[PDB]
Design an enzyme around this catalytic site. Structure first.
Site, PDB file in Angstrom:
ATOM      1  N   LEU B  39       0.257  -1.194  -0.149  1.00 41.14           N
ATOM      2  CA  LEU B  39      -0.107   0.123  -0.117  1.00 41.14           C
ATOM      3  C   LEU B  39       0.468   1.439  -0.020  1.00 41.14           C
ATOM      4  N   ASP B  40       0.753   2.005  -0.500  1.00 40.74           N
ATOM      5  CA  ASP B  40       1.561   3.231  -0.668  1.00 40.74           C
ATOM      6  C   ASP B  40       0.724   4.508   0.004  1.00 40.74           C
ATOM      7  N   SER B  41       1.730   5.779   0.185  1.00 43.21           N
ATOM      8  CA  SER B  41       1.225   6.741   1.296  1.00 43.21           C
ATOM      9  C   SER B  41       0.102   7.200   1.036  1.00 43.21           C
ATOM     10  CB  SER B  41       2.207   7.599   1.441  1.00 43.21           C
TER      11      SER B  41
END
Lengths: 58, 85, 166, 67, 55, 169, 110, 118, 457
Positions: B39-41
């Protein structure tokens, strides 16, 4: 202005009873005399417009 | 209708499984989204907003950074909305 | 912090998007468009360029800022029941109840008396533990968690216990 | 089952009971006040004759309690 | 004569829960239903003088 | 009765010719409720009126007339003024309720005609305009609060206008 | 029950010596009624559901059925009982079949 | 009061001075919160807490009246025109209406014939 | 009949044992107040004199009944206070109320101006000792000195006014004899004759100028809240304005014209401050300025309609403001501070007292005809006959009459109370009884308000 046919509408309303909506013969008389009275008022306005055209020529 | 502790965890896991971006086999409940799940920021804010839409909509801006794991997010949502007695 | 300021704006942008669009399928279309715009600058770390984009993020967003946004149900501020529906009763009023009426349903009164006796004994131990934390002023930002396992209760006991029920 | 929010209640409900007990105690002459119109006659409009101007009540119309 | 008497009935029916509000008789859970029953008969008593007005 | 004028008599008679139906809803409810509790209320009122039997006549209205007017006795003295000042205040309190009766005559006209309103009556309209105009000039209505000593000056002010206007013409 | 209340005012308003700008402004508003009335149907009721919450319960209660169904009598028979029984004064409908009479009904359609 | 753009998130920079500025704000915020925490979470209290900040707020309006106002300047005279001034404003309004009324009673009657109240 | 049993209250409190005191002072006072309504109400066309000129009859004063109504009520709310201190100190400050009751009866009854004056200023002495002692907060003396040096500075000119009238025109005495009075010729020498009679009553009935006498007396609380009811009695204690304006100067109303304009601005500016204020007692203190300012307007018009509204408002305000101060005292005894923002929480902690808070607040506004609708509206109706412009100014005031009441409600109707831990018991049986004994007499005036407004009614 109508007087005669307008009084007939009150006669149906006097002996109206339950389900008083069924009265079309008296209601049609109000739509006949007032339409002729409005046409008579329109005829007076048309007569004034016709008189202005004749006066401009002289 | 009242909400159960076992039911709330199953409801949160069902929404995460149909997200398409995250794998249904890789993460279950105990695995955190911060390290284990890809998962990205910017991805974490979108996932938290979708979870609020299904249940009682309450998400603080300051508490958004603290919640990341699905097991932790299910407990935080239940405590704020008063669940399991 | 730079990381927190981006996340706070991104959380607002998604919830403000559903006010303009009507259908949920159209909402998902614009959500992918927003992701592509921010990922272009997220790849590289900058001190001047990234901070310039943060002030630029306020623009365009402020041009379409008031279409009456949706807060859905009970939300902090906004519209439709912020403090409403939950009138509630304080914990101080519970002990204030007079005899005869307090005799009715004795299960709730006896269980509360046991918790009150435990809270009175733990209050002396919690006061020494709170000042034991190294600061030597008063406090730093947030309250500190408990270190001891035998005594229990992390500083505040009435903070989480007895709040509100809808 | 829950313990719920607690109020005083005991001091509050007692005052309303103590208030109404003294309304009811002097609610008996209120009940007699209805029967005073019922049993005893109130007043009738009549022209006065030159004999006596005032006796017991000088001039009072309606209700026997007025006289 | 009936027009004057029945007109005050509609006024009195709405005040009857207020007269029984101040303790009087005990009513548990029935008080919300008591308002419904008071206005139900208040409509019927108000329909007759309007039917009298058409006549 | 006697004092109040009102209308002489009302007609009120139903014909009912158009449509058979269930006779009339107004007529059927009137006959039913007359014997239901209206007859019981008339019987209970008659039972209490007969139970009275003995009743006191009583004086009710008091006399006391004239006893020298205020515009006859002068100079500041308590012996003469007090009887005169009580007479003027007696008249002023009655004249407050004299207008009320004439006002109620106009109230009775408004309801009884309805559609006519100002087209008919005329008698009650003329009676109200004459009294109120006289009440405005004579019984204060302009000269502050009620006082018997100030009333003589108010009557003198109206008398001075009558003497000045008539002398010119 | 719209013609027995709303349309009678519009037909009567046209035949008057009153202000022209006030008369023209009312005609736009009569057609403006259709927008927000459909903004309850088309915007929320009609089409694909927005889905407010995951697992939402909606059921008809015995108290609801007795209230809404008996309100339908009042919302339909209002133009039969109130309009017919009450004695009126001066009939307004006489002039302009297309300019005044038709304009009240055409505004709702357009 | 509002500007061209509403202030909420406008003009913000990290820097070095601003980073320590938020540290100064939290230092007082946590200090005043902990003394509340020590007073709230104990059953031995029973009563209403004082708080020195709230008492000084009430003291700002109820007191500190005559310790102030020692520099009068031109600001105090402008406030006097907004106070004693409007009292003189109605003096040329009520008198002009009364002189309009008093002239009508004596000559050319304007008062209604059906008037009797006061 | 009225005086003598009131004087016998003085040996009652001292002779009775230390355990009792309060039971004897309250119960015996209630039966004397019943007998005041029994005899005083009877009157003919013009109200005939009672006896010899020591205490006389009532002509247009049902306001004496209000003093008899507060006669036990000035002891009920003072029960929470005084109990901590000595038994001898308790007896002293009950007898100071008895002395107040002794002088207050004498003012309204005695139909005089010469001997009325030495009863008018005589009420100031017991209240001074009452205010200067038992004050929980400081500046008792910065309110105690201001209590006299506002009133006595304006009222001492009555000695050069009243005596000057009786030396030239007969004698003042009975007022029923006062028909010797000739209308004033209106000259520059006659200016200070009118001002000296007015300035005495311009202080007790607060205006826009010289109005600071009242808020200092209310904010700096004497004893609890029951003595603040006596401060309400002092406002209506200057009732002689009804008597002086009608009798002594009937022709003089040209010099009244600037004083109406002062009181008219003492309606907008006095209400505006009564919005952003901090103290709960102060928001009643400034609303009491504007409510009594309505009466001063009505007096100076001199129309028969205005005196009806004037006499009504004296009784209306005398039982609504005193009701509001008892609610302020009920929060002052629990929270121990008069701050509005800090003392926040109704219904949740105070379930039954909140309904009394509603009934007291709404009575300041024009409710269904209790007394204030017969009070306020009657003045507004009478001002139009004076001038057409008035209701443009008076209507704005009717908006801000809600802004006294509702702002007092809303700032207490928040169910937070996070800082507050006290106020366990909502109200004692006596505390709820106080609230009922103020509104229910006004609720009985709905049926017959003839004994609420009667100058030739």
């Amino acid at each position: 202005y109508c007087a005669h046919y307008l009084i007939r509408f009150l006669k149906c309303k006097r002996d109206s009873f339950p389900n008083f909506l069924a009265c079309k013969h008296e209601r049609h008389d109000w739509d006949y005399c007032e339409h002729l009275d409005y046409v008579k008022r329109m005829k007076e306005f048309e007569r004034e417009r016709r008189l202005l055209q004749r006066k401009k020529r002289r | 209708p009242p909400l159960t502790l076992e039911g709330i965890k199953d409801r949160v896991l069902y929404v995460l499984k149909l997200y398409d971006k995250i794998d249904p086999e890789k993460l279950s409940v105990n695995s955190h989204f911060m390290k284990d799940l890809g998962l990205d920021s910017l991805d974490q804010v979108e996932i938290i907003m979708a979870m609020e839409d299904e249940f009682g909509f309450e998400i603080p801006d300051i508490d958004a950074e603290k919640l990341m794991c699905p097991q932790e997010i299910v407990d935080y949502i239940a405590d704020k909305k008063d669940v399991y007695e | 912090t730079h990381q927190q300021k981006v996340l706070r704006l991104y959380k607002r942008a998604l919830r403000h998007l559903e006010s303009w669009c009507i259908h949920r399928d159209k909402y998902r279309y614009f959500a992918c468009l927003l992701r592509a715009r921010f990922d272009e600058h997220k790849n590289e770390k900058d001190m001047v360029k990234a901070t310039q984009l943060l002030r630029e993020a306020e623009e365009e967003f402020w041009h379409g800022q008031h279409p009456q946004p949706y807060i859905f149900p009970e939300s902090p501020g906004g519209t439709s029941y912020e403090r409403y529906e939950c009138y509630k009763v304080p914990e101080w009023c519970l002990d204030d109840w007079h005899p005869s009426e307090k005799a009715m349903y004795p299960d709730y009164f006896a269980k509360r008396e046991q918790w009150k006796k435990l809270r009175r004994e733990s209050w002396e131990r919690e006061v020494x533990x709170x000042x034991x934390x190294x600061x030597x002023x008063x406090x730093x930002x947030x309250x500190x968690x408990x270190x001891x396992x035998x005594x229990x209760x992390x500083x505040x006991x009435x903070x989480x216990x007895x709040x509100x029920x809808x | 089952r829950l313990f719920i929010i607690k109020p005083s209640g005991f001091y509050d409900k007692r005052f309303l009971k103590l208030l109404r007990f003294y309304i009811l105690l002097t609610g008996i002459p209120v009940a007699i006040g209805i029967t005073l119109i019922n049993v005893x006659x109130x007043x009738x409009x009549x022209x006065x004759x030159x004999x006596x101007x005032x006796x017991x009540x000088x001039x009072x119309x309606x209700x026997x309690x007025x006289x | 004569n009936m027009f004057s008497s029945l007109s005050l009935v509609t006024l009195l029916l709405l005040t009857m829960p207020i007269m029984m509000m101040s303790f009087n008789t005990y009513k548990p859970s029935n008080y919300p239903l008591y308002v419904k029953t008071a206005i139900s008969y208040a409509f019927i008593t108000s329909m007759i003088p309007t039917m009298m007005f058409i006549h | 009765x006697x004092x109040x004028x009102x209308x002489x008599x009302x007609x009120x008679x139903x014909x009912x010719x158009x449509x058979x139906x269930x006779x009339x809803x107004x007529x059927x409810x009137x006959x039913x409720x007359x014997x239901x509790x209206x007859x019981x209320x008339x019987x209970x009122x008659x039972x209490x009126x007969x139970x009275x039997x003995x009743x006191x006549x009583x004086x009710x209205x008091x006399x006391x007339x004239x006893x020298x007017x205020x515009x006859x006795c002068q100079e500041k003295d308590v012996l003469c003024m007090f009887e005169a000042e009580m007479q003027w205040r007696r008249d002023y309190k009655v004249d407050q309720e004299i207008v009320n009766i004439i006002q109620e005559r106009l109230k009775a006209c408004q309801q009884r005609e309805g559609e006519s309103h100002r087209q008919n009556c005329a008698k009650e309209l003329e009676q109200f305009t004459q009294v109120v105009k006289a009440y405005q000039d004579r019984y204060x209505x302009x000269x502050x609060x009620x006082x018997x000593x100030x009333x003589x000056x108010x009557x003198x002010x109206x008398x001075x206008x009558x003497x000045x206007x008539x002398x010119x013409x | 029950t719209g013609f027995y209340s709303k349309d009678l005012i519009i037909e009567a308003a046209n035949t008057s010596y009153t202000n022209a700008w006030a008369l023209l402004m009312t005609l736009i508003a009569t057609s403006f009624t259709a927008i927000y009335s459909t903004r309850i149907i088309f915007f929320a009721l009609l089409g694909q559901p927005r889905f407010p919450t995951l697992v939402n319960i909606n059921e008809n209660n015995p108290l609801l059925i007795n209230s809404i169904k008996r309100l339908l009598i009042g919302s339909l028979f209002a133009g039969y009982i109130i309009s017919n029984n009450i004695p009126p004064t001066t009939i307004p409908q006489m002039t302009m079949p297309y300019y005044l009479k038709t304009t009240a009904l055409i505004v709702t359609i357009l | 009061x509002x500007x061209x753009x509403x202030x909420x998130x406008x003009x913000x920079x990290x820097x070095x001075x601003x980073x320590x500025x938020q540290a100064e704000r939290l230092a007082i915020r946590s200090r005043l919160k902990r003394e509340y925490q020590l007073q709230y979470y104990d059953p031995s209290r029973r009563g209403v807490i004082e708080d020195p900040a709230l008492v000084r707020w009430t003291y700002a309006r109820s007191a500190n009246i005559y310790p102030n106002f020692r520099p009068n300047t031109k600001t105090s005279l402008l406030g006097a025109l907004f106070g004693i001034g409007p009292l003189v404003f109605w003096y040329y309004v009520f008198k002009t209406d009364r002189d309009r009324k008093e002239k009508l009673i004596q000559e050319g009657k304007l008062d209604r014939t059906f008037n009797i109240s006061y | 009949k009225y005086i003598i049993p009131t004087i016998m209250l003085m040996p009652l409190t001292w002779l009775s044992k230390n355990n009792m005191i309060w039971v004897n002072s309250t119960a015996h006072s209630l039966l004397i107040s019943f007998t005041s309504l029994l005899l005083m109400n009877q009157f003919g066309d013009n109200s005939l004199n009672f006896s010899l000129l020591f205490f006389s009859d009532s002509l247009s004063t049902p306001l004496l009944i209000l003093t008899m109504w507060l006669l036990p009520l000035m002891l009920m709310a003072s029960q929470h206070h005084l109990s901590k201190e000595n038994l001898t100190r308790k007896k002293l400050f009950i007898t100071m109320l008895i002395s107040l009751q002794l002088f207050l009866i004498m003012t309204f009854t005695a139909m005089e101006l010469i001997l009325f004056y030495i009863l008018f200023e005589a009420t100031l002495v017991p209240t001074l000792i009452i205010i200067t002692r038992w004050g929980n907060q400081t500046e008792r003396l910065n309110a105690g000195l201001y209590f006299l040096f506002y009133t006595l500075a304006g009222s001492l000119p009555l000695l050069v006014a009243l005596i000057y009238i009786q030396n030239t025109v007969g004698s003042l005495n009975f007022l029923m004899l006062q028909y010797w009075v000739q209308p004033v010729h209106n000259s520059w020498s006659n200016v200070f004759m009118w001002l000296a009679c007015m300035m005495a009553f311009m202080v007790k009935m607060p205006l826009y100028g010289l109005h600071l006498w009242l808020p200092k007396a209310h904010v700096e609380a004497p004893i609890a809240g029951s003595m603040v009811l006596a401060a309400v009695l002092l406002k209506l204690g200057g009732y002689g304005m009804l008597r002086i304006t009608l009798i002594l100067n009937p022709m003089t109303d040209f010099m009244a014209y600037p004083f109406i304009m002062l009181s008219l601005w003492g309606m907008i500016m006095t209400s505006s401050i009564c919005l952003r204020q901090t103290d709960l007692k102060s928001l009643i203190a400034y609303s009491s300025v504007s409510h009594m300012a309505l009466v001063i307007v009505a007096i100076l018009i001199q129309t028969p309609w205005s005196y009806m509204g004037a006499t009504a408002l004296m009784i209306a305000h005398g039982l609504t403001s005193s009701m509001l101060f008892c609610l302020a005292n009920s929060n002052y005894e629990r929270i121990h501070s008069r701050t509005m923002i800090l003392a926040r929480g109704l219904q949740t902690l105070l379930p039954l007292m909140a309904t009394w808070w509603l009934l007291a607040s709404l009575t300041n506004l024009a409710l269904p005809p209790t007394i204030n609708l017969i009070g306020e509206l009657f003045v507004v109706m009478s001002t139009f006959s004076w001038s057409n412009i008035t209701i443009i100014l008076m209507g704005v005031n009717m908006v801000i009459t809600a802004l006294y009441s509702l702002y007092m409600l809303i700032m207490t109707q928040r169910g937070k109370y996070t800082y507050h831990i006290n106020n366990i018991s909502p109200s004692f049986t006596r505390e709820n009884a106080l609230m009922s004994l103020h509104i229910l007499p006004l609720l009985l005036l709905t049926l017959n308000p003839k004994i609420i407004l009667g100058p030739l009614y």
